[PDB]
Structure formats: C-alpha cells, structure tokens
Design a protein around this ligand. Structure first.
Ligand SMILES: *[C@@H]1O[C@H](CO)[C@@H](O[C@@H]2O[C@H](CO[C@H]3O[C@H](CO)[C@@H](O)[C@H](O)[C@@H]3O)[C@@H](O[C@H]3O[C@H](CO)[C@@H](O)[C@H](O)[C@@H]3O)[C@H](O[C@@H]3O[C@H](CS(=O)(=O)O)[C@@H](O[C@@H]4O[C@H](CO)[C@@H](O)[C@H](O)[C@H]4O)[C@H](O)[C@H]3O)[C@H]2NC(C)=O)[C@H](O)[C@H]1NC(C)=O
Ligand SMILES: *[C@@H]1O[C@H](CO)[C@@H](O[C@@H]2O[C@H](CO[C@H]3O[C@H](CO)[C@@H](O)[C@H](O)[C@@H]3O)[C@@H](O[C@H]3O[C@H](CO)[C@@H](O)[C@H](O)[C@@H]3O)[C@H](O[C@@H]3O[C@H](CS(=O)(=O)O)[C@@H](O[C@@H]4O[C@H](CO)[C@@H](O)[C@H](O)[C@H]4O)[C@H](O)[C@H]3O)[C@H]2NC(C)=O)[C@H](O)[C@H]1NC(C)=O
Ligand SMILES: *[C@@H]1O[C@H](CO)[C@@H](O[C@@H]2O[C@H](CO[C@H]3O[C@H](CO)[C@@H](O)[C@H](O)[C@@H]3O)[C@@H](O[C@H]3O[C@H](CO)[C@@H](O)[C@H](O)[C@@H]3O)[C@H](O[C@@H]3O[C@H](CS(=O)(=O)O)[C@@H](O[C@@H]4O[C@H](CO)[C@@H](O)[C@H](O)[C@H]4O)[C@H](O)[C@H]3O)[C@H]2NC(C)=O)[C@H](O)[C@H]1NC(C)=O
Ligand SMILES: *[C@@H]1O[C@H](CO)[C@@H](O[C@@H]2O[C@H](CO[C@H]3O[C@H](CO)[C@@H](O)[C@H](O)[C@@H]3O)[C@@H](O[C@H]3O[C@H](CO)[C@@H](O)[C@H](O)[C@@H]3O)[C@H](O[C@@H]3O[C@H](CS(=O)(=O)O)[C@@H](O[C@@H]4O[C@H](CO)[C@@H](O)[C@H](O)[C@H]4O)[C@H](O)[C@H]3O)[C@H]2NC(C)=O)[C@H](O)[C@H]1NC(C)=O
Ligand SMILES: *[C@@H]1O[C@H](CO)[C@@H](O[C@@H]2O[C@H](CO[C@H]3O[C@H](CO)[C@@H](O)[C@H](O)[C@@H]3O)[C@@H](O[C@H]3O[C@H](CO)[C@@H](O)[C@H](O)[C@@H]3O)[C@H](O[C@@H]3O[C@H](CS(=O)(=O)O)[C@@H](O[C@@H]4O[C@H](CO)[C@@H](O)[C@H](O)[C@H]4O)[C@H](O)[C@H]3O)[C@H]2NC(C)=O)[C@H](O)[C@H]1NC(C)=O
Ligand SMILES: *[C@@H]1O[C@H](CO)[C@@H](O[C@@H]2O[C@H](CO[C@H]3O[C@H](CO)[C@@H](O)[C@H](O)[C@@H]3O)[C@@H](O[C@H]3O[C@H](CO)[C@@H](O)[C@H](O)[C@@H]3O)[C@H](O[C@@H]3O[C@H](CS(=O)(=O)O)[C@@H](O[C@@H]4O[C@H](CO)[C@@H](O)[C@H](O)[C@H]4O)[C@H](O)[C@H]3O)[C@H]2NC(C)=O)[C@H](O)[C@H]1NC(C)=O
Ligand SMILES: *[C@@H]1O[C@H](CO)[C@@H](O[C@@H]2O[C@H](CO[C@H]3O[C@H](CO)[C@@H](O)[C@H](O)[C@@H]3O)[C@@H](O[C@H]3O[C@H](CO)[C@@H](O)[C@H](O)[C@@H]3O)[C@H](O[C@@H]3O[C@H](CS(=O)(=O)O)[C@@H](O[C@@H]4O[C@H](CO)[C@@H](O)[C@H](O)[C@H]4O)[C@H](O)[C@H]3O)[C@H]2NC(C)=O)[C@H](O)[C@H]1NC(C)=O
Ligand SMILES: *[C@H]1O[C@H](CO)[C@@H](O)[C@H](O)[C@@H]1O
Ligand SMILES: *[C@H]1O[C@H](CO)[C@@H](O)[C@H](O)[C@@H]1O
Ligand SMILES: *[C@H]1O[C@H](CO)[C@@H](O)[C@H](O)[C@@H]1O
Ligand SMILES: *[C@H]1O[C@H](CO)[C@@H](O)[C@H](O)[C@@H]1O
Ligand SMILES: *[C@H]1O[C@H](CO)[C@@H](O)[C@H](O)[C@@H]1O
Lengths: 183, 183, 183, 183, 183
C-alpha cells in the first residue's frame, strides 16, 4: 500500500476577547445591574466572561421582563448574530409562547431584538444575518410571555431551559451567517 | 472567517404571582363583586389572574362609573405603575373624553388614580412613576366620560377599545419606570 | 430589575340610557313644559339628555318656584340618589337659605325631595340613600328660598351657581351610596 | 355596580320683583297708609318687600276691619292666587269665625276677595284659581269676624296666628293653580 | 566469516500530488478564503502544498471557530484518515478542552469530522478508519473549545501547539489504518 502523509501544524496563542459578558463592565454602574433579585432572577457571567447563566422565575404576569440582567461589553467593533437556539421543557404543556432577548443602548433604546422562541417553537430562520455592533457596552434584557393556564400551582425550579449561542466576528467586512457545528 | 461563539443558558422556573386580578380574592366578598351586570358590564380575570378583560357599555350619562368591577390581590409588597396605554375607536367621532382607572382601599378611599385617556388622547407622560403598594387586596374601578352627541342612537358592541398594561416589580427599592418592549 | 406586566383590555360598547333629561319626553305635553319663561327661567337638557343646564332668576319673593322646568324620563327601573352637590356665590353675602329639587308624579305628587342647600350650606349627608324609581316620566321642579336683604337692587346674571349630580343604577338590587370620584 | 351620573348645573341670577308689599309704594300717599295705629294694629312689609308681618288687635266689635294696612305694588302684569293658608289659636275656644283679605283699587273698590277662614276653619278649596292682576298699586285690607264670648276679659298678644301665601306668576298665559311645596 | 550481501535498488520518480492544501485552489474563490484575519488567525499552505501551518488566537468565547482557514484539493479519488496527533502546552493549566477539525463540502455540509483533542487529551483511538474522499475541493475548518479561567489575562503567542498528520492513499481499495513511523 502507498500512504501519503500531510502534516498540519497549529500553534495556539491567546487574545483579549472582542466581546464579553460582565456585571458592571469597566465599573459602569448602569450596565448589568439586575443580575440578582432574591426570589425572581439569579444571573451570572460564565467563567472568563465567555457567556452567561441565568435562573429565571416566571409567574402569572402576561409579560415577564428581566431588564438589565447582564452587561455586554464590546472591546472592538465587529458583526454579531444569533447562531443557534435550543429549547426544552419538563412540563406536560409547553410553558412559553414567546421569548425575546434584547441588546440595548445605555439610554434603554433597542439596538437589536433576538426572537428566541415564537408561538412556542424555536426561531426556525437561524442563524440570523450578521449585523455590525460598535465598541462600548450594552444593557441586555430578556422578555418571556408564558402560556397562561400551563404554569403549575406549586412552584418549580426546572420548568424549561433555553440555550442560546451568539456568534461574534471581529472582521472589518460582514461574514456569511456561519452555523455553529457540533464538536 | 473567525467566529467567536458565546453561550447563554437560561433555566426557567415558576413562582406564585406577586399580584393578580381576581373575583372575590381569598373569598373576600367585598372585593371585585361587580364584575357582571347583565346589560351594562361583563368583566373577567384573564387566564391565571394574568390581567383582565371587560366589555363595558357606556350611555348618555355624563359620567359612566364601573365600581368594583375587578379585584386586585397583592401577595407581596412592591412598586406598581401604568406602563402603557393604547386606545382606538371604530366610530367617525372620538367617543371618550376622559377615562380613569382607580385602585381603591376596601373602605372606598382612592389609593392611586390612573388617567388612561385625557381630552380624547392617551396619557402622553407614560410610563408613570413606580409607587409602593402594600400586600392585601384592592377594589378596582373604571370611570368613563363620553363625548356627548357622538354616541350613535343604535346600540353597538365595538365602539372603542382600551388596552392597558400595569407594571409591577417585587423589589424592595423602587426601579426606574421601565417601558414594556414589543416582543 | 424584574418587572411583571399585567394587561387589562376594555372594549367599549353603547347602550340606550336608563334615564335621561328631556323636554316633553315621548311627546308627553305635560312633562317638562316650563323650560322657558322669557325673563325668569331658561332651562335646557344637556347634550344627548345627559343632564340639564338652567339659568334661573330669583327675586324678592319669599319662595321662588320653578315648576316643571325639566322632564325626567326613566326607560328602565333602577335606583336613584343625590350623589354630589357643589355651591358657590359671587356676592358679598350668601344669597340662598334653602334650595330643594323635587321629582314629581304627573299628578303633581312628590315622589322624592332632594335638599341641595339647607340654611345656606350644601347638604352635608351626601351621597344619599339609593331609592327605587319606576319606569315612566316625571315632572322635575326647583324651589329656592333667598336670604332677603342680600339680593342687590341692580339685576345680575351670575349671583350664584349650583352643580348637582344624580347617580342612577339600572340594577335589580340596591347598590351602596357610591360617591362620584374626581376624573 | 354600574352607576350612571347625570349633572344638573343651575346658574342663579337676580331680577326686580313682579310684585312686592310696601308702605306708600312709589311715594303714593294713598296706598298702605294705616300700617300703624298705636294700640290696635302694627304692620310692616317683610324684608325686601317679600311679604308682610302684622300684629292685629281684635275686640268685641262684631266686625273688626283693618283698612289699607299694607300696599301691594305690581310692577308687571301677571296672575295671582291664594296658594296656602295655615291657622292656629292658643285659646280654649276658637276665636275667629270669618277672616277675609281684600285687594282693592285706589278708589276703594274690591278687585279680589280672599276668604282665609270660614266658619272657624281654613279655606278648604285652596289653592285658588289664578286671576289676572294689572300693573299699578293696590290697597290691601283685612276683615275679621270674632266668635263673641270666646275673647278673654284680660288682653293678650298671642290669641291666634294666620299664615297666608300668595302665589304670583309673571307669565302671559294663566298657569294651573300650583300648590306651594314644603322645602 | 561468511557474509551474503543482498542488493536493493530504489529508483525515485516524481508524481503530481493526489491531494494538497492550498488557498483558492484552481482559482475557486469560495475554498480557503479565511486564511488571514489580521489579529486572530494567520494560516498558510506548507511548501508545495505538503500540509499547512496556522497561528490561531483563542479568546474567552466558549467556542472559537476558524471557518474556511484552508482549502483541501483532491486531484484523484482515494482514502483519507487521521494518522497521528500530538499536543503540548506551555501554560500551568491545560488550555483546550476540545479541538475538532472538519472537512466540509462547498455548501458548508460536514463531510468528515476529526476529533483531535477530547476533554483535554489527544484522541486515543488513532489512527482512524480510512474513509473514501472524492475528487474536487473542500473547505477545511477548525473548532476549539478552551478551558475557561485557564487563559492568561496578558496575551501570548505560544500557549499551545497541535501537530496533526492526515494519511491519504490513492488506491482503489481501502488500506488498513497504517500508523506513521518515526523517520
Ligand atoms: C442600574 O442601571 C439602570 C440602567 O437602566 C439605571 O436605570 C436608569 O436610572 C436612571 C435614574 O435612576 C435613579 O432613580 C432610580 C429610581 O427611579 C433608582 O433606582 C436609581 O438608583 C437612581 O437613583 C434613569 O434616569 C431617569 O431619571 C433621571 C433623574 O434621576 C433623569 O435624568 C433621566 O432623564 C431619566 O428620567 C434612567 O432612565 C433613562 O435615562 C435616559 C437618560 S440618561 O442616560 O439617564 O442620561 C433617557 O434617555 C433619554 O431618552 C430620550 C428618549 O425619550 C432620548 O432622546 C435622549 O437622548 C436620552 O437622553 C431614558 O429615556 C430613560 O429611560 C434609567 N435607565 C433606563 C435605561 O431606563 C439605574 O439607575 C441603575 N441603578 C443603580 C443603583 O446604579
Ligand atoms: C360588594 O362589595 C362592595 C364593596 O364596596 C360592598 O359595598 C359596601 O357595602 C356596605 C354595606 O352593604 C350592604 O348594603 C348594601 C346596600 O346599601 C347591599 O348591597 C349589601 O349587600 C350589604 O347588605 C357599605 O357599608 C355601609 O353600610 C354599613 C351598614 O350596612 C355601614 O356599617 C358602613 O359604615 C357603610 O355606611 C360599604 O360602604 C363603606 O363602608 C366603610 C366602612 S366598612 O368597610 O363597611 O366597615 C366606610 O368607611 C369608613 O369611611 C370613613 C370615611 O368617611 C373612614 O374614616 C372610616 O375609617 C371608614 O370605616 C365607607 O365610607 C363606606 O362607603 C360599601 N363599600 C364601599 C366601598 O362603599 C358590598 O356590600 C358588597 N356586596 C356584597 C353582596 O357582598
Ligand atoms: C304643562 O304641563 C303641566 C303639568 O303640571 C300641566 O299642568 C296641568 O294642567 C291641568 C289643566 O291645564 C289646563 O288649564 C291650564 C290653566 O289652569 C292651562 O295652562 C293648560 O294649558 C290647560 O288648558 C291641570 O288639571 C286641572 O284642571 C283639569 C281641568 O282642566 C282637571 O281635570 C284636573 O283635575 C285639574 O283640576 C293639572 O292639575 C292636576 O290634575 C291632576 C289630575 S290629571 O292629571 O289632570 O288628570 C290632579 O290629580 C288628582 O289629584 C288628586 C289629589 O288631590 C288625586 O287623588 C287624583 O288621583 C289625581 O287625579 C292634580 O291634583 C292637579 O293639580 C296640571 N298639573 C299639575 C301637576 O298641577 C299643563 O296643563 C301643561 N300645559 C300645556 C299647555 O301642555
Ligand atoms: C340631604 O338630602 C337628602 C335627600 O336628598 C335628605 O334625606 C332624607 O332624609 C329624610 C330625614 O332626614 C333626617 O334624618 C337624617 C338621618 O337619617 C339626617 O341626616 C337629616 O338631617 C334629617 O334630620 C328622610 O325622611 C324620612 O323621615 C321623615 C320624618 O322625619 C319621613 O317623613 C320620611 O318619610 C322619611 O322616612 C328621607 O327618606 C326618604 O324619603 C322619601 C320621601 S321624601 O324625599 O322625604 O319626600 C321616601 O320616599 C317615599 O317612599 C315611600 C315608600 O317607602 C313611597 O310610597 C313614597 O311615594 C315616597 O315618597 C323614602 O322612602 C325615604 O327613604 C330622605 N330623603 C331622600 C330622598 O333620601 C337629607 O336629610 C339631607 N340632609 C340634610 C343634612 O339636610
Ligand atoms: C290714606 O289713604 C287713604 C286711601 O283710602 C285715603 O283715603 C281717602 O281719603 C280721601 C279724602 O281724605 C281726606 O279726608 C280724610 C278725612 O275724611 C283725611 O283723613 C285725609 O287726610 C284727607 O284730608 C277720600 O276722598 C273723599 O273725599 C274727597 C274730598 O276730600 C272727595 O273728592 C272724594 O270723592 C271722597 O268723598 C277717599 O274716598 C274715596 O274717593 C274716591 C275718589 S278719589 O280717589 O278720592 O278721587 C271715591 O271713588 C269714586 O267712587 C265712585 C263710586 O261711588 C266711582 O264711580 C268713582 O269713579 C270714584 O271716583 C270713593 O268712593 C271714596 O271712598 C279715601 N279713599 C277711600 C278708598 O275711601 C286717605 O286720604 C289717605 N290719608 C293720607 C293722610 O294720605
Ligand atoms: C276660598 O277662597 C277663594 C278666594 O280666595 C274663594 O273663591 C271664590 O269662589 C267664589 C264662589 O265660590 C263658591 O263656589 C265654589 C265652587 O266653584 C265653592 O268651592 C265655594 O265654597 C263657593 O260656594 C267665586 O265667586 C263667583 O261666583 C259668585 C256667585 O256665587 C260671583 O259673585 C263671582 O263674581 C264669581 O263668579 C270667586 O271667583 C272670582 O271672583 C272674583 C271677585 S271676588 O273675589 O269674588 O270678589 C272675580 O273677579 C272679578 O272679575 C271680573 C272679570 O271677570 C272683574 O271685572 C272684576 O273687577 C273682578 O272683581 C273673578 O272673575 C272670579 O273668578 C272666587 N274668588 C276668587 C278671588 O278666586 C272660595 O270660594 C273659598 N272657598 C271656601 C270653601 O270658602
Ligand atoms: C469565501 O468563501 C466562503 C465559503 O463558505 C463564501 O461563503 C459563502 O457566501 C455566500 C454568499 O456570500 C456573499 O455574502 C457574504 C456576506 O453574507 C459576503 O461575505 C460574500 O463576499 C458574498 O458577497 C453564501 O451564500 C448565501 O447567500 C447567497 C446570496 O448571496 C444565497 O444564494 C445562498 O443560498 C446563501 O444563503 C454561502 O452560504 C451557503 O450557500 C449554499 C448554496 S451556494 O453554494 O451559495 O449556491 C447553501 O447550500 C444550500 O443549503 C441547503 C441546506 O440548507 C442545501 O439543501 C442546498 O443543496 C444548498 O444549495 C448553504 O446552506 C449556505 O450556507 C457561503 N458559504 C457557506 C458554506 O456558508 C464567501 O462568499 C467567500 N467570500 C468571497 C469574498 O469570496
Ligand atoms: C476589512 O479589512 C480586511 C483586511 O484586514 C478585508 O479582508 C475586508 O474586506 C474588510 O475590508
Ligand atoms: C431591597 O433589598 C435589595 C436586596 O435584596 C436591595 O438591592 C435594594 O436596594 C433594597 O434595599
Ligand atoms: C337583581 O338580579 C341580579 C342578577 O342579575 C342580582 O345580582 C341582584 O341581587 C338582584 O336580584
Ligand atoms: C304668553 O306668551 C308666552 C310666550 O312668551 C306663551 O308661552 C304664552 O302662551 C302666552 O301667549
Ligand atoms: C483497486 O484496483 C486495484 C488494482 O489496481 C486492486 O488491487 C484493488 O483491490 C482495487 O480493486
């Protein structure tokens, strides 16, 4: 048998993140200041600012809104998009009608709106178009619209889970909407 | 292209509502007992107490008053405000001059007054200041002042519609007046 | 911050009035026929029958009586009461000792007597008890007792003003005496 | 509960009286000149000419006559009637058989005769028919016929009291005989 | 002593490569166009297309993805496999959790997935099964999943190195998975 071998050599270095999740980034007391309300939300930046984790309590309210629960810091200009969403629930009936995640200016204006879940199903059109985002820092906020009547009378900690991936690229020109592979 | 992906994970739990709309909450026969007068008003709490729906018949009377048409139960202390109002009418002429919604003590004293419509237009100053409301239960009542001469001689079911959103926050300290986003 | 939003939706329809003020209601030439005596009284039903407006000239007579100045039509049985009275005067001295407003049967019998002003002050006991009134039509008449010596020698158009609100409810069972709020 | 409120607004002005009681009206030295005879009669116009008050001493005479004790001035033509009479006495026996009040022309002719009391009782047919009276001024006179034997030997100031109400209307056409209500 | 000598004679010729690494192979502007993003990746084909060299900057992002950083051209059909992987790092803590290298169709579909590093260690099952690959050209892309918290705050050029050997055989029938010897 004849085998030809081709050698790839990859050297790995380390660079400061183009964007990261944080509480009060750069000491800005207006960005990400509602990470923790002692029976209703508990959110934290994932290790090294790599993402975020949130425990979120919905109720009977027709809109449940988690304003400024995280801060998004962007160190260098680039293009951002919603790359992937995954949704699952433990209940007999689907608990969420609509879930939307907002990136917002410090003055509370919406910069970008990301529909995660629509009429009870994940956004089907993903990955979304890469849109430019400027350097600075942004309020990030979550809105949930439950399906009324489906929420149990007895409280619970594990009604549903939403996993979301944002893709960011630090390029000068817009990339295609690249979908995130399985590792 | 280089894409960096950041993962948000949101776990959703369920909590008993800080406030809810109800008829005779906790069996209190004095709160919300006028939800239904068989040709003049028909009001109901929206599913799970998430809000309310009312069909309301105005007449030629210079003030039309719907006393105790709903009950508001508040399970834990918090801050309440008028977040958003929307108003529209099907007639050629605007039917309503003033519409005001009252939260009232069990003794019929006004706790808070919410002007929904003033001189024929929605309240422009919204969202209103968050004000503290104590735990307990409250009478809620609607006053409408028509524009006389505009109401048709023949009855109708769809003269106008008023949509109102109350924001409530279960925090110890007052929030900013956060406006409700579009989903 | 966590905000829970609760949505009220009010749909407004239109219904023929349970009672209204009119001149010669249903063409009845005996009800409300003294709305206009060309130097002494000029009364009219407010727009759509929503109430009434009267210009009323008092004189030196010890009783000044305005018989049948308005007609009250009641289309459906219900409970009526005097909800609120407001009184003010432009003169140096209080011009009115007693003012009383009567609802009367077609045969001139008194059905209900409403004391608006007593010994120069508004009725303090208001709102009055809701009393049943049958469908049909009623003479309405005003009696004023001036304070003699207080009326100026020179005539005037704006000596005093009396504002009165009647509450009517089309319910089968008597309501509490609900006071009219400020809008 | 549903309450409909109807607003009456009454604005009160002031007008020179269509008729009034006076002593020597317009300076006419023939009208009302016997208001005061120093042990037998003392009569005065009530404040602003609104009526009259008289202290009247009867004696053993079979007719007691108080000629021209008041003057009646009529500024504009209208219809006059005896609206109400009330009579009471402090004695054991009824002191008066007949009491009659006359409106008289300046020449002493009777224009109208008002029987107040007949055979010891008030006129039962009241209110009387409205009759036209012309502008000008009139003598007014009282006749009393006692029941002899009933008057005490010792004089007294409070044997009996007669209260009389005249209705006047300044209309061109005759009204019905409207009875004066209780305030 | 008796020595028997056996003569091997090897004549060496030269043949166009069955596959090679390239930027935009055959002028195809869609294959290998992300070899260079000026602070995040710098990749080049090794001399004569014999392999590739890449400098790759990871950050705090939970997935770091280097899409289309090289082009793989395959001139004749054959069988390809991952022959050998070697991994080392200069840091105190292991920087990489998972590293995966993808061969992809021009439409961005995954043809083959090569797990280089899994849970911080090199793939232990190597050499992998030879799988057929058709003639044409392929996108090649690298995904790295760091261990968060391990990456230093100060940037560096030499955090880790990954050396990878792909074996290719131009035979019609699949060979055994032959491991690459040390020279
Ligand atoms: C946590 O981070 C939050 C980020 O949202 C902060 O919320 C912001 O609070 C401001 C005032 O907060 C004070 O009062 C609250 C109680 O109400 C306390 O909880 C706080 O501790 C603090 O004491 C609020 O500002 C409003 O009030 C100001 C006076 O105090 C007044 O100057 C402002 O104009 C507001 O009325 C923020 O609200 C936003 O303010 C911006 C202007 S600025 O950024 O404040 O300068 C407004 O933008 C204007 O909007 C118009 C459009 O209508 C634009 O044309 C114009 O260009 C732009 O300036 C927003 O409309 C207004 O909503 C409020 N932030 C948001 C996004 O609502 C909170 O304070 C932080 N808490 C702590 C403890 O750090
Ligand atoms: C439905 O829910 C309604 C809630 O408003 C109830 O209305 C309340 O009705 C009370 C009596 O109702 C009875 O009579 C009506 C007919 O009139 C029937 O329809 C009912 O079925 C029932 O049979 C009424 O109380 C009044 O009457 C009482 C005697 O019966 C008397 O003790 C009260 O004082 C009242 O005069 C409610 O009216 C309010 O009462 C409170 C006191 S309390 O809450 O009743 O104890 C008053 O507050 C006082 O006010 C002063 C200020 O002036 C304060 O300083 C003082 O602290 C405070 O106590 C209110 O002024 C007075 O209006 C009446 N509720 C309201 C808000 O008006 C209705 O009953 C319910 N119907 C059914 C069938 O459940
Ligand atoms: C405007 O509306 C007014 C409403 O009050 C009308 O007033 C009513 O006028 C009747 C007659 O009017 C005629 O004469 C006047 C001049 O006097 C003109 O201005 C009118 O244009 C018209 O030409 C008057 O009726 C009286 O006269 C009748 C004969 O003409 C006689 O049959 C009546 O009995 C009266 O004497 C109204 O007076 C009331 O009448 C009722 C009976 S009914 O309703 O007329 O049938 C009486 O009720 C009786 O009373 C006893 C108690 O004592 C009860 O037991 C019994 O059950 C009941 O029948 C009233 O006592 C009596 O006062 C008079 N209405 C009132 C309330 O006084 C006016 O006509 C209208 N004008 C126009 C132009 O339309
Ligand atoms: C403010 O204005 C109110 C009306 O607008 C006045 O209310 C009236 O109160 C009368 C007694 O008021 C006294 O007592 C209260 C304490 O309760 C005090 O606050 C007052 O200062 C005052 O001292 C009340 O009258 C009742 O008692 C009378 C004996 O004194 C008696 O003659 C009456 O019959 C009553 O029982 C009034 O109650 C209603 O009266 C009407 C008739 S009318 O309006 O008075 O002419 C009745 O209607 C009758 O009902 C029967 C059936 O039962 C029918 O067949 C009939 O055809 C019909 O006439 C009601 O039944 C009766 O409830 C009351 N009036 C009203 C209309 O509510 C109040 O006093 C004023 N306040 C002040 C400070 O001046
Ligand atoms: C107070 O007001 C009283 C109103 O009645 C005045 O009474 C009227 O007094 C006249 C004369 O008074 C003089 O004399 C008395 C003593 O007797 C004094 O007290 C007075 O101060 C005063 O000095 C009196 O007139 C009579 O006398 C006249 C001559 O002095 C003579 O001209 C008259 O004709 C009388 O005889 C009034 O009597 C009435 O007079 C009218 C006419 S007029 O109005 O005087 O012009 C007569 O009417 C005529 O009658 C016929 C019918 O028979 C008709 O057809 C004809 O058209 C009509 O003219 C009356 O019949 C006659 O009674 C007398 N008034 C009355 C009503 O009797 C009194 O003077 C005043 N006092 C003061 C101080 O001011
Ligand atoms: C209560 O008091 C009332 C007056 O305050 C009395 O009314 C008067 O009734 C007289 C007749 O009464 C009899 O009939 C009724 C039934 O209808 C019964 O209830 C009574 O008990 C009694 O039996 C009436 O008189 C009329 O008839 C007379 C004949 O008997 C005749 O002489 C009169 O002329 C009348 O036709 C009264 O009617 C008015 O009278 C005045 C004059 S006066 O007041 O009587 O002196 C007339 O004025 C005249 O009018 C003309 C123009 O037409 C002028 O030119 C002239 O200058 C002027 O004098 C009226 O025209 C006439 O209508 C009547 N009086 C009044 C003032 O209304 C009642 O009887 C007393 N009730 C009791 C129980 O005692
Ligand atoms: C560098 O090389 C890259 C190789 O990946 C190129 O990426 C490809 O870009 C296409 C469009 O690029 C244009 O827009 C971007 C900004 O977004 C600029 O950077 C570029 O310069 C350029 O201007 C992109 O195509 C998409 O957009 C097209 C419209 O412009 C549209 O026709 C396509 O359908 C895409 O939506 C490529 O994305 C892939 O396209 C293929 C089809 S095709 O190969 O384009 O014809 C899709 O395959 C389809 O997928 C379904 C499964 O869902 C299959 O059933 C079906 O058979 C198949 O056709 C892919 O799903 C879609 O992702 C994009 N390539 C990839 C792999 O994503 C880049 O352009 C090159 N840049 C330069 C400057 O040369
Ligand atoms: C940003 O600049 C890069 C070069 O670094 C280009 O590749 C891109 O097209 C954009 O101009
Ligand atoms: C209520 O308490 C919370 C902590 O749960 C504070 O954030 C707030 O300022 C108020 O004191
Ligand atoms: C009239 O009827 C209504 C029902 O429409 C009841 O609520 C009331 O008690 C009265 O009987
Ligand atoms: C007097 O005139 C009035 C109009 O002012 C009429 O109502 C009445 O009938 C009489 O003719
Ligand atoms: C491809 O063809 C070769 C001959 O060149 C065989 O050895 C092999 O088995 C496959 O058929």
């Amino acid at each position: 048998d004849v085998i030809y071998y081709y050698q790839g050599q990859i050297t790995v270095g380390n660079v400061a993140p183009p964007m990261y999740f944080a509480i009060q980034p750069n000491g800005n007391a207006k960005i990400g200041n509602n990470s923790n309300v002692p029976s209703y939300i508990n959110a934290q930046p994932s290790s090294g600012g790599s993402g975020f984790t949130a425990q979120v309590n919905i109720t009977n309210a027709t809109y449940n809104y988690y304003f400024n629960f995280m801060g998004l810091a962007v160190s260098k200009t680039g293009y951002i998009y919603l790359a992937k969403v995954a949704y699952s629930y433990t209940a007999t009936n689907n608990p969420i009608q609509n879930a939307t995640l907002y990136i917002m200016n410090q003055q509370g204006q919406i910069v970008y709106k990301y529909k995660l879940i629509v009429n009870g199903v994940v956004n089907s059109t993903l990955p979304s178009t890469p849109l430019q985002i400027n350097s600075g820092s942004y309020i990030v906020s979550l809105l949930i619209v439950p399906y009324q009547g489906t929420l149990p009378k007895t409280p619970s900690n594990d009604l549903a889970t939403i996993t979301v991936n944002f893709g960011f690229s630090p390029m000068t020109a817009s990339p295609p909407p690249i979908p995130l592979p399985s590792p």
